[PDB]
A paper describes a structure:
Phosphotriesterase-like Lactonases (PLLs) are appealing candidates, being natural lactonases endowed with promiscuous phosphotriesterase activity. PTEs and PLLs belong to the amidohydrolase superfamily, and share the same (β/α)8 barrel topology. SsoPox exhibits high acyl-homoserine lactones and oxo-lactones hydrolysis abilities, and promiscuous, low phosphotriesterase activity. SsoPox is a very appealing candidate for the bioremediation of phosphotriesters because of its unique thermal stability, and its ability to resist aging, solvent and protease treatments.
Of them, the most active variants, αsA1 (C258L-I261F-W263A), αsA6 (F46L-C258A-W263M-I280T), αsB5 (V27A-I76T-Y97W-Y99F-L130P-L226V), αsC6 (L72I-Y99F-I122L-L228M-F229S-W263L), and αsD6 (V27A-Y97W-L228M-W263M) were subject to kinetic and structural characterization. Although the active sites of the improved variant structures superpose well onto the wt-structure, all selected mutants display altered loop 8 conformations. Changes are subtle for some of the variants (e.g. αsA1), but are large for others (e.g. αsC6). However, the active site cavities are larger for the mutants: most selected mutations replace residues with smaller ones: W263 is mutated into M/L/I, V27 into A, I76 into T, L130 into P, Y99 into F. Only two selected substitutions relate to bulkier side chains: Y97W and L228M. Interestingly, variants αsA6 and αsC6 exhibit enhanced lactonase activity against γ- and δ-lactones, while αsA1, αsB5 and αsD6 show reduced lactonase catalytic efficiencies.
Residue numbers in the entry:
A (entry chain A): 2 to 258, 279 to 314
B (entry chain C): 2 to 259, 277 to 314
Write the structure that this text describes.
C-alpha cells in the first residue's frame, strides 16, 4: 500500500500514529547547488535526527514529508534519517510553486507533467527505488494562476492512474484551497483523497467547514511555527471543530524547519476540554489511515 | 588576471580567439535535481567535447560560458570537458532570472547577494578551486523588476570589489539592455566592463549604437538561432555596424552549442564579412582585442 523511504511497503492499516505534514529539511535546489557553502549537511542531519527520535519517543510511528520540487526534496538525505532512526517516512512527488513553473515547462503539457509524478510513484525517486506515496501542490497569495492550475490538473491525472492521495498547500485567507478542491473534484478525484493544507491559519471557521463539508480533510498543520495565528487561537478552532463533529475530517501537524509542540501544548489542551483519547486517535491514526487507503 | 576552469590563471593579453557567450549545458536546477531520468549526461558530454573541439580547429582558444544560477551551472561538468578538449574555459557567477528570486532571497539583502558572487570570484565555485572570471545578470520581457534590479546592484558591488566584467542577458525589443547599463553605470561601473547581451536580435540599429556610444560592448551573440532574426538579417546589422566603425565595441557569439552550432560564424558570418570589405584586423579586433580589454 504505502511506500516508505528505506524500508519496504507497509499496509495502510499499520501506518500508526502519524504526523501528516512535516519537513525534514527545506531549500531552493538552485541555491544549494550553486552555493553549497551556505549549508551545513552535518548540522542539518543532526538536528533532524534529534527531532525525529524525540517524536518517536512520544509515540509517532510515521512522518509524511511533503517536500517536493521547489523546496528541495532529496531522497538520499531522507533514507539517511530513516536508517539513523527507524521512522516510517513517506516521501511524495509533485511541484511546489505559487506563480510560474520553471522554464523547462514552457510548451510542456499537463500530461507530460503528470508523467513526472507517475514516474516518481511507479519507477521511483531521483534514481532510487524509494517511491512517492502521494502528490503535493501549492497555491498561496497569488491565487490560482495558469501554471498553478496546470500543476493541480496533473495531480488529478496522477491520482487517477495511481490512486495515491494529494496534499495541498494553500493560503487560508484567499479561497485558494476551496479552488483546489473544486478543480480536483471536477476532474474526478475522490474528495476524500485530498488534504487541503494550512486551514489552521484562519479563525474563519465557516470557510474551513465549507471545505470539510465537500468531503476533503482540513489541515490544521502549522502548529508552533505560529507567525500566522498564535498557538492559542489554533488550539480553539481545533477544539471548536471537534465539538461540532468534524473530527473525521481533521488532520494536525507542524510544518517545521519543534516537531513535538502538539504533545506539549495541543494534545494536553484538548484533553482538558473533554476530548477523549478516541478523538485524538481518530485524528492521528484513523484519518491518516483512510486518507492512504 | 583571468581564472580558468581546470588550469592556472592566464594573462588578459593571452585569451586568443574568444567566443564570449557559449553554454556547454543548460538546465533548470530544480527539474534535474528532482527528475534526473529526463537527462542523459553521457550524451551531453560527447556533444560538449565534440562541439568544443570543432571550435578549436577554427582556432578558438578561449570560450566564456555564462551558465549561472537558474540555468544549471556545474563546474564539475565544465572541468570534465576541459580535460577532454584542452580549452581555456572561463566560468562565471551571478543570477539568471526574469521576475522573482528564489524563496531563499526573501527579505535578504543586496550585499548578502553580492557576497555569493564575491565568494565564487575570490574563494571558488561550488567549493572547488575554479574561480569565476565575470558576473552574469539577466532581464527580459518582464522588465526591470524589483528582484532583477537587486541582482544588478549585487553585480555592481562585485565589479567594484574584484573588477571582473559583467555580461548581461537582455531583451533587444524593450530597452532592458540599456537600463542594465544605466543602473550599473549609475552605481559607477565602468561602461567598458559591461557586455550587454542579445542586441543582435533586433533590426533597430539606432538602439544598438546608443549602448555602444555610452561605452559598453554590444552582444551580437545568438548566431544561428533563427527564431529571433535570421542569419542573413544579423550579418548586415553586423556589417553596417562595422562600416560605421563600431568594431571596437562589437562582440559576436552563438549562445549555445547544437543549421545552428558552436561554429556557424566560421562557415558563414566570417566569410560574409570578408567578401564585404572587412579585413583580418577588424575581426581580430572583435574576437581577440575586444575580449582582451573587457577582461582587463
Ligand atoms: Co541569454
Ligand atoms: Fe509544508
Ligand atoms: Fe546565453
Amino acid at each position: 500500500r504505502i511506500p516508505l523511504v528505506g524500508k519496504d511497503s507497509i499496509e495502510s492499516k499499520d501506518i500508526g500514529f502519524t504526523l501528516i505534514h512535516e519537513h525534514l529539511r527545506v531549500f531552493s535546489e538552485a541555491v544549494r547547488q550553486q552555493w553549497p557553502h551556505l549549508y551545513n549537511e552535518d548540522e542539518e542531519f543532526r538536528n533532524a535526527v534529534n527531532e525525529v527520535k524525540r517524536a518517536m519517543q512520544f509515540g509517532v510511528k510515521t512522518i509524511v514529508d511533503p517536500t517536493v520540487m521547489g523546496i528541495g526534496r532529496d531522497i538520499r538525505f531522507m533514507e539517511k534519517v530513516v536508517k539513523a532512526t527507524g521512522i516510517n517516512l513517506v516521501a511524495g512527488t509533485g511541484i511546489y510553486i505559487f506563480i510560474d513553473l520553471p522554464f523547462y515547462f514552457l510548451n510542456r503539457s499537463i500530461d507530460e507533467i503528470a508523467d513526472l509524478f507517475i514516474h516518481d510513484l511507479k519507477e521511483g525517486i531521483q534514481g532510487t527505488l524509494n517511491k512517492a506515496g502521494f502528490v503535493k501542490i501549492a497555491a498561496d497569495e497569488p491565487g490560482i494562476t495558469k501554471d498553478v492550475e496546470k500543476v493541480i490538473r496533473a495531480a488529478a491525472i496522477a491520482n487517477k492512474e495511481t490512486k495515491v492521495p494529494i496534499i495541498t498547500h494553500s493560503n487560508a485567507h484567499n479561497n485558494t484551497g476551496l479552488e483546489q478542491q473544486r478543480i480536483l473534484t471536477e476532474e474526478g478525484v475522490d474528495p476524500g483523497k485530498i488534504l487541503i493544507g494550512h486551514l489552521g491559519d484562519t479563525d474563519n471557521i465557516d470557510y474551513i467547514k465549507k471545505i470539510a463539508d465537500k468531503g476533503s480533510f482540513i489541515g490544521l498543520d502549522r502548529y508552533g511555527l505560529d507567525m500566522s495565528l498564535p498557538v492559542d487561537k489554533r488550539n480553539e478552532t481545533t477544539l471548536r471543530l471537534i465539538k461540532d463533529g468534524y473530527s473525521d475530517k481533521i488532520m494536525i501537524s507542524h510544518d517545521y524547519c519543534s516537531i513535538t509542540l502538539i504533545f506539549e501544548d495541543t494534545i494536553p489542551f484538548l484533553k482538558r476540554n473533554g476530548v477523549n483519547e478516541e478523538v485524538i486517535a481518530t485524528i492521528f491514526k484513523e484519518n491518516p489511515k483512510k486518507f492512504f487507503s
